[PDB]
Design a protein around this ligand. Structure first.
Ligand SMILES: *[C@@H]1O[C@H](CO)[C@@H](O[C@@H]2O[C@H](CO[C@H]3O[C@H](CO)[C@@H](O)[C@H](O)[C@@H]3O)[C@@H](O)[C@H](O)[C@H]2NC(C)=O)[C@H](O)[C@H]1NC(C)=O
Ligand SMILES: *[C@@H]1O[C@H](CO)[C@@H](O[C@@H]2O[C@H](CO[C@H]3O[C@H](CO)[C@@H](O)[C@H](O)[C@@H]3O)[C@@H](O)[C@H](O)[C@H]2NC(C)=O)[C@H](O)[C@H]1NC(C)=O
Ligand SMILES: *[C@@H]1O[C@H](CO)[C@@H](O[C@@H]2O[C@H](CO[C@H]3O[C@H](CO)[C@@H](O)[C@H](O)[C@@H]3O)[C@@H](O)[C@H](O)[C@H]2NC(C)=O)[C@H](O)[C@H]1NC(C)=O
Ligand SMILES: *[C@@H]1O[C@H](CO)[C@@H](O[C@@H]2O[C@H](CO[C@H]3O[C@H](CO)[C@@H](O)[C@H](O)[C@@H]3O)[C@@H](O)[C@H](O)[C@H]2NC(C)=O)[C@H](O)[C@H]1NC(C)=O
Ligand SMILES: *[C@@H]1O[C@H](CO)[C@@H](O[C@@H]2O[C@H](CO[C@H]3O[C@H](CO)[C@@H](O)[C@H](O)[C@@H]3O)[C@@H](O)[C@H](O)[C@H]2NC(C)=O)[C@H](O)[C@H]1NC(C)=O
Ligand SMILES: *[C@@H]1O[C@H](CO)[C@@H](O[C@@H]2O[C@H](CO[C@H]3O[C@H](CO)[C@@H](O)[C@H](O)[C@@H]3O)[C@@H](O)[C@H](O)[C@H]2NC(C)=O)[C@H](O)[C@H]1NC(C)=O
Ligand SMILES: *[C@@H]1O[C@H](CO)[C@@H](O[C@@H]2O[C@H](CO[C@H]3O[C@H](CO)[C@@H](O)[C@H](O)[C@@H]3O)[C@@H](O)[C@H](O)[C@H]2NC(C)=O)[C@H](O)[C@H]1NC(C)=O
Ligand SMILES: *[C@@H]1O[C@H](CO)[C@@H](O[C@@H]2O[C@H](CO[C@H]3O[C@H](CO)[C@@H](O)[C@H](O)[C@@H]3O)[C@@H](O)[C@H](O)[C@H]2NC(C)=O)[C@H](O)[C@H]1NC(C)=O
Ligand SMILES: *[C@@H]1O[C@H](CO)[C@@H](O[C@@H]2O[C@H](CO[C@H]3O[C@H](CO)[C@@H](O)[C@H](O)[C@@H]3O)[C@@H](O)[C@H](O)[C@H]2NC(C)=O)[C@H](O)[C@H]1NC(C)=O
Ligand SMILES: *[C@@H]1O[C@H](CO)[C@@H](O[C@@H]2O[C@H](CO[C@H]3O[C@H](CO)[C@@H](O)[C@H](O)[C@@H]3O)[C@@H](O)[C@H](O)[C@H]2NC(C)=O)[C@H](O)[C@H]1NC(C)=O
Ligand SMILES: *[C@@H]1O[C@H](CO)[C@@H](O[C@@H]2O[C@H](CO[C@H]3O[C@H](CO)[C@@H](O)[C@H](O)[C@@H]3O)[C@@H](O)[C@H](O)[C@H]2NC(C)=O)[C@H](O)[C@H]1NC(C)=O
Ligand SMILES: *[C@@H]1O[C@H](CO)[C@@H](O[C@@H]2O[C@H](CO[C@H]3O[C@H](CO)[C@@H](O)[C@H](O)[C@@H]3O)[C@@H](O)[C@H](O)[C@H]2NC(C)=O)[C@H](O)[C@H]1NC(C)=O
Ligand SMILES: *[C@@H]1O[C@H](CO)[C@@H](O[C@@H]2O[C@H](CO[C@H]3O[C@H](CO)[C@@H](O)[C@H](O)[C@@H]3O)[C@@H](O)[C@H](O)[C@H]2NC(C)=O)[C@H](O)[C@H]1NC(C)=O
Lengths: 244, 49, 244, 49, 49, 49, 49
């Protein structure tokens, strides 16, 4: 795998007391061959060595497994009387293949919230580490959400800004397709695909922002060389900051 | 026999070369990203004043 | 790919409360080899890191796929009694090849409105994110157009200015040929071609203008190095402004 | 065998060089555009008064 | 016998190495000419304006 | 008999090849890690100032 | 041995100190951007006297 985008880091800017997520993009190197990215076989490690943080595997989920019909029209917004079905997985056709992708990390997050809630509902997963809500009033009835890590993001629906609050139980990573991915259902990144990797921090690693520190991420699939990503992080300069 | 033992040295030498391939590709990905970061910091050092 | 023109940015000048589009031109670097720009394989990302906007893939459509006969004489203006067929894709011949291009982003937008409406009509696409009309009276009957992002542009027909209103559902990018493109139908930019890239903002990213902010765009084809474009944007100074 | 293992080191070293090529071209496109922007801002700084 | 079978593995391994030789020389001739062409286009890109 | 004694030379030559396999793989793992470490120290030497 | 003097202000009063130096020596101390107290490491973006 090659790093095939910038590494983006999000924090509670400007206050910089708390850390939200990292996002980056990967693709198979030099277009030569496909890479298995199944979260059962692959590991993603995360280390901030200066502060003694070292996680040997944070990779839990992939939307590469997920067909558009499993996520589109399955989360919805109540704008007053009106109820709007969201489209989250976009799709296009070439040579009789349907390509699938998520246009941004926000639609990927909502598609994951749905997918993991549906896997909990199906008894396949014990608890989702991610919970996403628009209504904050709910939180008083769910005291476990009080102490875990929370960040917010906005999407637009019927031209209206909808804020979502994402509650994160533990530090975890997920992957989702960004382009060149016709193999929906498979967890395989084919040569000339582009895959988003997103790390959401839990209340442990979130506790204070990375500054004057080296962060290393390593993706190790079951075949082929691992991709090792390292940044020395200066003070973060915006709501999102480009760290590498 | 001439091949059986010769087949043992082929298996082993493939694995040995694959181990160098694994290390060289990983460490190339590492160093090229250190270069990317350095190039960015070099521009930032020339622009910021 | 190389950036082979200035980066143009359009806003609701002088009021600067709302953001319309970005336009820029790309070509294969140093004339060495061709680049696949199919929107199934390629991604275009857009990030305004300061405000936390990060879109992993906005690229949806290309007029490189489109033959002149698919767009010429297929949109028309009713000037009173008279009805005028528009020519949108211009063409010229060299060495037995027909070159195809759009002279401006306005004819490219109209050619795209037609193409996407025709793909919706053919059931190949669920909805067009772009809708273009001259008649604003229609909007009262189509309330979804009330809240999404709108900008206007003029073309001249029978020496008369015709204003078109472009309604944009979500932030998306498209590409179209500008010169040196004989490969109509292919989505491939050959060496020594020039390709227009245009980003139209949806009601999310449109919400307020870029000022005192860094905007990064990255085009990542399925083979070869991505093109990363970055501008720090000062206050925009006209209906269109040169940002890079 | 001498070639089979030798063919493993060629594949890997090609990929390793292609990764540097990918990074160097991308980062050259980046820095040259930072230069373009800087040159523009330098002229604007000399002209505007 | 020790040589007869051993002579079968020598013939085959020669052919196998000769096949890599054939491919590597051809592909070196190819890539070096792609380099020649690229160097020319790079100079033309720097000179033409 | 022709096979019984011939079976003694096959067992022994397998073990002999397996011993080279064992050594070559171990020493490849060693040297490739010395290379990894060296590449890291080379980058550190170029970056630190 | 070598002697020089310097003044500091304490309760708004000038206090002169006399520094006696046995041999030529150098020392370092943090000036800014140094959170790594205890380490002897100057991190990137620190300033060391
Ligand atoms: C938008 O999202 C809704 C919630 O996920 C979804 O409702 C679910 O619909 C399925 C079966 O779909 C049929 O019935 C729905 C109304 O419920 C119709 O909108 C649709 O056209 C089909 O006739 C149903 O099994 C499930 O219980 C519903 N869930 C809820 C919470 O009501 C909508 O179908 C979906 N699409 C539209 C067009 O509204
Ligand atoms: C993320 O997954 C959660 C499950 O892990 C899910 O919570 C459940 O919500 C359903 C009702 O969902 C509908 O209504 C909400 C508003 O109440 C809409 O935002 C949503 O789009 C649906 O139309 C509820 O029955 C159930 O008790 C909840 N389960 C738990 C464990 O709390 C979240 O709704 C989901 N996030 C989003 C944005 O859909
Ligand atoms: C993180 O782990 C918590 C403890 O292991 C767990 O708290 C329990 O939650 C259950 C069910 O409530 C939640 O179910 C989903 C997870 O499937 C949540 O996303 C959502 O917020 C629901 O409200 C609850 O019955 C139980 O009492 C809680 N127990 C404890 C000890 O806290 C969280 O659910 C889990 N995930 C998140 C997102 O916080
Ligand atoms: C978010 O959850 C709230 C409680 O969990 C819920 O409020 C409850 O709903 C009714 C009152 O109607 C509300 O409806 C509108 C639209 O949702 C609100 O904007 C308005 O302020 C009303 O409060 C009531 O039975 C119940 O007591 C309310 N509980 C509380 C604590 O207010 C909200 O309706 C729900 N959605 C939104 C958008 O806020
Ligand atoms: C994301 O969505 C939020 C709610 O969907 C919205 O906040 C609402 O807007 C106003 C208050 O103004 C906000 O504006 C600035 C810039 O957006 C914020 O940084 C600031 O903190 C203010 O909150 C208010 O009418 C409404 O009650 C707000 N709702 C909530 C829940 O806060 C945000 O403006 C919008 N954008 C951003 C960048 O956060
Ligand atoms: C200008 O644009 C018109 C609308 O796209 C187009 O009309 C369409 O024509 C096709 C077939 O073309 C024949 O018939 C038209 C009249 O309809 C003649 O102008 C033309 O010379 C051909 O004889 C027809 O299938 C389609 O239904 C028509 N669409 C509409 C809305 O009427 C015109 O053909 C085109 N060119 C000229 C010269 O007017
Ligand atoms: C462009 O608009 C002109 C008016 O601004 C118009 O000229 C006038 O046309 C009318 C009607 O005659 C023309 O009808 C068709 C147009 O489709 C022509 O092909 C035909 O040759 C007729 O001339 C006429 O009464 C009036 O004298 C004209 N005005 C002047 C000042 O000469 C043009 O016809 C119109 N062109 C097109 C192609 O729509
Ligand atoms: C952009 O594509 C739209 C479809 O996505 C299309 O709307 C359709 O318009 C047709 C009629 O088109 C003719 O008439 C209009 C004026 O009414 C002319 O501007 C146009 O050139 C054509 O001659 C209508 O039958 C259909 O119901 C509309 N479909 C939808 C979904 O509204 C727009 O016309 C098109 N924009 C342009 C400038 O052509
Ligand atoms: C953006 O998304 C909207 C919701 O997904 C969608 O609104 C629906 O529009 C359909 C059909 O009307 C339009 O069809 C084309 C798109 O193919 C538009 O360009 C044009 O304006 C037509 O009027 C309508 O039947 C349906 O009720 C609407 N539903 C909702 C929930 O809004 C828009 O069409 C789509 N595109 C644009 C340009 O706004
Ligand atoms: C844009 O759409 C309008 C309604 O969607 C339509 O007006 C309707 O058309 C007739 C009246 O004739 C009009 O025709 C001319 C030329 O189009 C207009 O300039 C003139 O002002 C007339 O209004 C009528 O049946 C209907 O009630 C009208 N509806 C409304 C709301 O006015 C326009 O004709 C059409 N085109 C233009 C150029 O405005
Ligand atoms: C998006 O929000 C709009 C308001 O900001 C809303 O327009 C208003 O709608 C009301 C009710 O009428 C619509 O109800 C459904 C929506 O589900 C439509 O399909 C239907 O065509 C009705 O028009 C209306 O009283 C009011 O006039 C509208 N406002 C304006 C300025 O026209 C939209 O309906 C809503 N869209 C969706 C899909 O939720
Ligand atoms: C683009 O086309 C518009 C309509 O096709 C045209 O507006 C018409 O022109 C006059 C009003 O004068 C306008 O002039 C200035 C400069 O062009 C505008 O900035 C200003 O806002 C005025 O609107 C009027 O007769 C007619 O009703 C107008 N029609 C509409 C729909 O506004 C514009 O002048 C033309 N050019 C530009 C730069 O917008
Ligand atoms: C540094 O501190 C000295 C003592 O703490 C102080 O000297 C005392 O000041 C006066 C004498 O005047 C001095 O003033 C000038 C300028 O400061 C000196 O350069 C000059 O040599 C004089 O000594 C006296 O009352 C007292 O006894 C002095 N004490 C000693 C020990 O000399 C210095 O003035 C002060 N500043 C400098 C620049 O040396």
């Amino acid at each position: 795998l090659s790093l095939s985008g910038n590494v983006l880091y999000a924090v509670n800017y400007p206050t910089n007391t708390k850390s939200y997520w990292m996002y980056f993009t990967v693709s198979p190197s030099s277009g030569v061959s496909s890479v298995d990215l199944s979260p059962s076989t692959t590991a993603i490690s995360f280390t901030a060595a200066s502060r003694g943080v070292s996680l040997s595997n944070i990779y839990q989920f992939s939307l590469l497994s997920v067909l558009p019909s499993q996520v589109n029209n399955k989360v919805q917004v109540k704008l007053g009387t009106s109820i709007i079905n969201l489209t989250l997985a976009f799709s296009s056709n070439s040579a009789g293949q349907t390509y699938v992708y998520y246009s941004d990390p926000n639609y990927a997050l909502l598609a994951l919230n749905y997918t993991l809630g549906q896997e909990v509902k199906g008894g396949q997963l014990t608890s989702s580490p991610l919970y996403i809500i628009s209504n904050t009033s709910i939180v008083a009835s769910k005291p476990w959400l009080k102490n875990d890590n929370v960040f917010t993001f906005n999407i637009s629906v019927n031209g209206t800004e909808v804020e979502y609050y994402a509650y994160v139980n533990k530090t975890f990573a997920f992957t989702y397709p960004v382009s060149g991915f016709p193999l929906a259902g498979s967890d395989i990144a084919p040569a000339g695909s582009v895959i988003g990797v997103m790390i959401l921090f839990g209340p442990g690693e979130a506790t204070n922002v990375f500054q004057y520190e080296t962060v290393t991420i390593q993706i190790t699939p079951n075949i082929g060389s691992p991709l090792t990503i390292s940044q020395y992080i200066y003070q973060p300069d915006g709501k999102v900051t480009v760290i590498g | 026999l001439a091949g059986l033992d010769t087949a043992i040295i082929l298996i082993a030498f493939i694995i040995t070369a694959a181990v160098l391939a694994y290390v060289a590709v990983n460490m190339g990905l590492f160093v090229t990203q250190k270069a990317k970061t350095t190039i960015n910091k070099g521009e930032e050092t020339a622009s910021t004043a």
